[PDB]
Enzyme design. Structure first.
Site, short mmCIF file in Angstrom:
data_model
loop_
_atom_site.label_atom_id
_atom_site.label_comp_id
_atom_site.label_asym_id
_atom_site.label_seq_id
_atom_site.Cartn_x
_atom_site.Cartn_y
_atom_site.Cartn_z
N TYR A 56 0.85 -1.18 0.00
CA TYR A 56 0.00 0.00 0.00
C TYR A 56 0.89 1.24 0.00
O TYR A 56 2.04 1.15 0.41
CB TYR A 56 -0.90 0.08 1.23
CG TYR A 56 -2.24 -0.60 1.08
CD1 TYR A 56 -2.30 -1.96 0.80
CD2 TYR A 56 -3.44 0.08 1.22
CE1 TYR A 56 -3.50 -2.62 0.66
CE2 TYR A 56 -4.66 -0.57 1.08
CZ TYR A 56 -4.68 -1.92 0.82
OH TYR A 56 -5.88 -2.58 0.67
N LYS B 282 -1.02 -0.76 -4.46
CA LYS B 282 -2.38 -0.26 -4.57
C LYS B 282 -2.22 1.21 -4.12
O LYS B 282 -1.91 1.47 -2.96
CB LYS B 282 -3.43 -0.95 -3.71
CG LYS B 282 -4.82 -0.35 -3.84
CD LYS B 282 -5.83 -0.89 -2.83
CE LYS B 282 -5.82 0.01 -1.59
NZ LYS B 282 -6.70 -0.53 -0.52
C1 LIG Z 1 -10.63 4.92 0.73
C2 LIG Z 1 -11.51 4.15 -0.26
O1 LIG Z 1 -12.71 3.93 0.00
N1 LIG Z 1 -10.83 3.80 -1.36
C3 LIG Z 1 -11.41 2.88 -2.37
C4 LIG Z 1 -10.36 1.84 -2.88
C5 LIG Z 1 -10.84 0.38 -2.46
C6 LIG Z 1 -9.72 -0.50 -1.87
O2 LIG Z 1 -8.58 -0.70 -2.32
C7 LIG Z 1 -10.09 -1.25 -0.56
O3 LIG Z 1 -11.29 -1.47 -0.30
O4 LIG Z 1 -9.11 -1.57 0.13
C8 LIG Z 1 -12.00 3.75 -3.54
O5 LIG Z 1 -12.62 2.83 -4.46
C9 LIG Z 1 -13.09 4.74 -3.02
O6 LIG Z 1 -14.04 3.99 -2.26
C10 LIG Z 1 -13.80 5.46 -4.19
O7 LIG Z 1 -12.76 5.97 -5.07
C11 LIG Z 1 -14.75 6.54 -3.72
O8 LIG Z 1 -14.06 7.61 -3.06
#
Ligand SMILES: CC(=O)N[C@H](CCC(=O)C(=O)O)[C@@H](O)[C@H](O)[C@H](O)CO
Ligand SMILES: CC(=O)N[C@H](CCC(=O)C(=O)O)[C@@H](O)[C@H](O)[C@H](O)CO
Ligand SMILES: CC(=O)N[C@H](CCC(=O)C(=O)O)[C@@H](O)[C@H](O)[C@H](O)CO
Ligand SMILES: CC(=O)N[C@H](CCC(=O)C(=O)O)[C@@H](O)[C@H](O)[C@H](O)CO
Ligand SMILES: [Cl-]
Ligand SMILES: [Cl-]
Lengths: 293, 293, 293, 293
Positions: C136, C164
């Site tokens: 990460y 990620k």
């Molecule tokens: C902080 C967060 O929620 N980040 C998401 C990434 C999902 C992810 O890698 C996880 O669930 O660990 C994004 O998809 C996010 O939900 C989306 O961009 C809306 O802000």
């Protein structure tokens, strides 16, 4: 040099509707602080004086007026910092010529300066004016170790007297008073006067002393005497007042409170909202009734 | 009004050892940008020009010199913002009188201003000068919803053309281009030119275009054409250069690079370190050999 | 190895009113993602799966269910990071035994860990499981050189495949691709997919792909093809939906959108609000009408 | 109820080289705190006990061992907070069954929770256990009015006794005592004990009390008595020790200091560095020589 310990009001300035300085009103603010607030001194040209929204000539006019009105009745510190070091030197020379007891200068802002650049800024203002200097909390510190080292470097110039401490870090405050016991510290957070005084700060510079000077002195003196229960009661009432002032608009509320005491504190200077709304005036009347009547 | 889209170099200023403006050197910087960097315009009086460390008279001198040297060869934007709104109006009137194509103004700084105060600041500069205005990213936003609402309020004055976007928030960028499609956006982060251009920014204002204008134009044009693989290769080399410039000292390194190209870019203005150390000069020679030879 | 590029939905989990896992609903979410969203794979046990509010046994149950339902139809990444390294190793071993294609792990949190501690954490999970790892974004960075330096150190382990990327820093993103071109990057910000794809990311992991997977794939593939006008239009519609989702409550709104398509996405897990209000359900239906009908 | 005012050491836990709990060493740490540090009680399962890196079963083992060793000699508070509310309820029930005098719980973390979610979390732990609760400073506050408002909402539950205050905001601290004078506050910053005691805190919970409990009690009691000169001298020596501890590595240095007094404080738990370097051991011995000899 005159004793610079104690209670210093950060001087507010009276402006006319058009943004120009109201000299009569400014003299009334000065007289209120000296005669009624019974301050030990005035801190002129700081943030509270709306300094950074003014021209160099306006800054000089305010320094003239404050020194002429206060004479030698109280101590006077002139804040002359700027992003323009040539302006800071010019203002520092002028305040020195007028007889100010010492200079102070904010850290150069708008750009991010390195520590060497900040020290050179202070050393240059000192060298060009011949006046002693009060520095401001060093910005963007990553640790107390670094903070103390940097104060130690500033504190290599014998004309640096100490600091106007605004950082909300009492660990750093304690470390600084221990490491450099002969250098002074002025608290720059009126709502945190009691805890600062418990660690031995030498004075306080504040905007709310323009109207709450009586309680500010009581908190400071009671705390130095170890009468913490009573000091805290007075800090509690003070902070009820300060919470109301902050919520309503800091400089406008203090000016509206001064108007209720017969002082022509005027308008604020634009780009700050210049005229208090009816609501702001209403809140200022309520605060005066509850805490300054 | 002249087309303001495209590549604008944020004009660096040449200073003498004593901090005064070197007019001959400034004209050489201007000529290098127009004739060799082939920029669409110059952004004069911004952060990159060391503007906030100067007097009002010095700012006027730089506006005079840049307009006299550039004439009508390229578009010219004058940054006239200040904490002093009376100064911003004075500078805006002067730049307007000189024929600048549009004004721009940083958000008033040093104090924390409310949104209404920021909008009144911009509306006042516009009303007093009669010139169109480019605003700066709105500080301290808590959300994109609020950000778009506030741009929408600024964007109630028809003379606000768009924004010099410095915030590292491409979600907000996309939202702003969608909500206000006729308003322009200039990227203010040279190392993020490719992703900004992928979202349809209309141009870029940058300090590194003073020496890297050729690659900057290539990235912008290739990206708008969808040639992302090649644009990224050029952004990679550009960012190797930018990483070296940032590590070595931004304005000093660009000036030292200009000196290696025969431009008398001079010293920096104090409180910034005015003279490049031997090490800084050494790093600038290495960057020129690797990326601008 | 099983291809890990492309579109990965960060799997949502269905909970009963009492907070226990609803296995039937979880299987419906998985089926929706595979059969309707046409994802390349699922990212299981991440933030979006409400992982950090669950017990180790519940996390194992979700890993079991996802692998049993998805079988080998799509790629599967298991997020096994924790503040408890013994737990991360246990989960990594279990996900490896089940056949997950790769592991991923959040930086250890709550406490402030040094870089050597973070690298030892990743190296320990890898050594104890024998599986590849996706790291990460490293937190609390002070600069891009150091950020890149630290990714270099992590990448000395050949089993670390990439990152990620959730940090909102596209300069760092570009520097990562420049420095380590063979290492993979997955975008973790659905609303910034276009600009991330313009910089060469290899895929994306997102919560909104559970309902907007069709548009998400279009943005990604169109941007890779250099079809920016078309990709930007789809990103604009996508961000209208994402803005509404975020304003209404991310987790609960995506579950309600799934419920409207006949997927029993269930409740959220406490300490998150478990049930949507009537207003939240109404807004979710409006979002479905406008963007997913 | 059992008095919870005064000096509480945040209990450190002894770990074996493999990360398992060293029960004999943990009992020695407890005995040291009770018999030598003369604490009023122990705060078990907090940050200082490396709690968040452990399994639920390990947390239960530490609760069992601490209660069996301390018996009823001192007050005992059990920190049972988690991101997993079901885990917090399980731990709260177990600590209640064992006879702990009060529960405490960190704000749920990792995710961003709303205030209503945080209040429901606390109310759930209380309702399911029947025990009193000490909350933690509310995170991400934007103002003191809202911070005070939210503590008011938490304090509507009569079983919420007060807060373990870690925020570095003494204005908020003063406002909390003003607003809710009958509610308790424990300082959570050992190096700021004097100023916190000047504002009326009811006790302190700290990691350094495991080795500096004698001075910690002196600072607290001297400050309450208004003996500020004497309290400040002891705070100065204390902060010389704390500065060294922090620079050398907090957890590992306090364990090494305990080892020099014959307490088998063991290793730290991974992902924290488990063993001290030779340099860290040398510095810890120097700190012991200077401040604890
Ligand atoms: C902080 C967060 O929620 N980040 C998401 C990434 C999902 C992810 O890698 C996880 O669930 O660990 C994004 O998809 C996010 O939900 C989306 O961009 C809306 O802000
Ligand atoms: C940031 C700020 O306002 N600081 C003031 C210090 C006064 C001072 O040194 C100045 O005006 O420069 C304080 O008096 C402050 O106004 C007061 O504590 C209310 O917050
Ligand atoms: C903060 C800053 O330097 N921003 C520059 C924008 C130029 C600009 O608008 C100005 O000088 O006011 C960028 O060109 C920047 O110098 C460059 O991207 C390197 O970081
Ligand atoms: C963040 C932290 O470590 N805070 C400690 C409070 C201990 C506490 O309440 C806990 O362990 O939960 C302080 O004792 C701290 O260790 C000490 O003041 C040194 O900074
Ligand atoms: Cl000294
Ligand atoms: Cl528009």
């Amino acid at each position: 040099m005159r004793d610079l310990k104690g209670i210093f009001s950060a001087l507010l300035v009276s402006f006319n509707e058009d943004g120009t300085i109201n000299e009569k009103g400014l003299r009334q603010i000065i007289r209120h602080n000296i005669d009624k607030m019974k301050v030990d001194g005035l801190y002129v040209g700081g943030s509270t004086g709306e300094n950074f929204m003014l021209s160099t000539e306006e800054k000089k006019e305010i320094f003239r007026i404050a020194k002429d009105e206060a004479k030698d009745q109280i101590a006077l510190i002139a804040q002359v910092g700027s992003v323009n070091l040539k302006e800071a030197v010019e203002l520092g020379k002028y305040a020195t010529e007028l007889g100010y007891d010492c200079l102070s200068a904010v850290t150069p802002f708008y750009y991010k300066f390195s520590f060497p650049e900040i020290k050179h800024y202070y050393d240059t203002i000192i060298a060009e004016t011949g006046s002693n200097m009060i520095v401001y909390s060093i910005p963007f510190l990553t640790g107390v170790n670094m903070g103390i080292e940097q104060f130690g470097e500033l504190y290599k110039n014998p004309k640096v007297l100490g600091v106007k401490f605004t950082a909300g870090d009492f660990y750093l405050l304690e470390r600084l008073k221990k490491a450099y016991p002969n250098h002074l510290i002025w608290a720059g957070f009126d709502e945190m006067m009691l805890p600062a005084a418990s660690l031995g700060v030498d004075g306080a510079i504040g905007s709310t002393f323009n109207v709450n000077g009586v309680r500010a002195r009581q908190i400071f003196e009671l705390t130095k005497a170890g009468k913490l229960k009573e000091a805290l009661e007075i800090q509690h009432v003070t902070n009820d007042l300060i919470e109301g002032i902050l919520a309503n608009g800091l400089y406008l509320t203090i000016k509206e409170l001064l108007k209720l005491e017969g002082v022509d504190a005027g308008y604020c200077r634009e780009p700050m909202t210049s005229k208090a709304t009816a609501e702001q005036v209403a809140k200022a009347k309520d605060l005066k009734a509850k805490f300054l009547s």
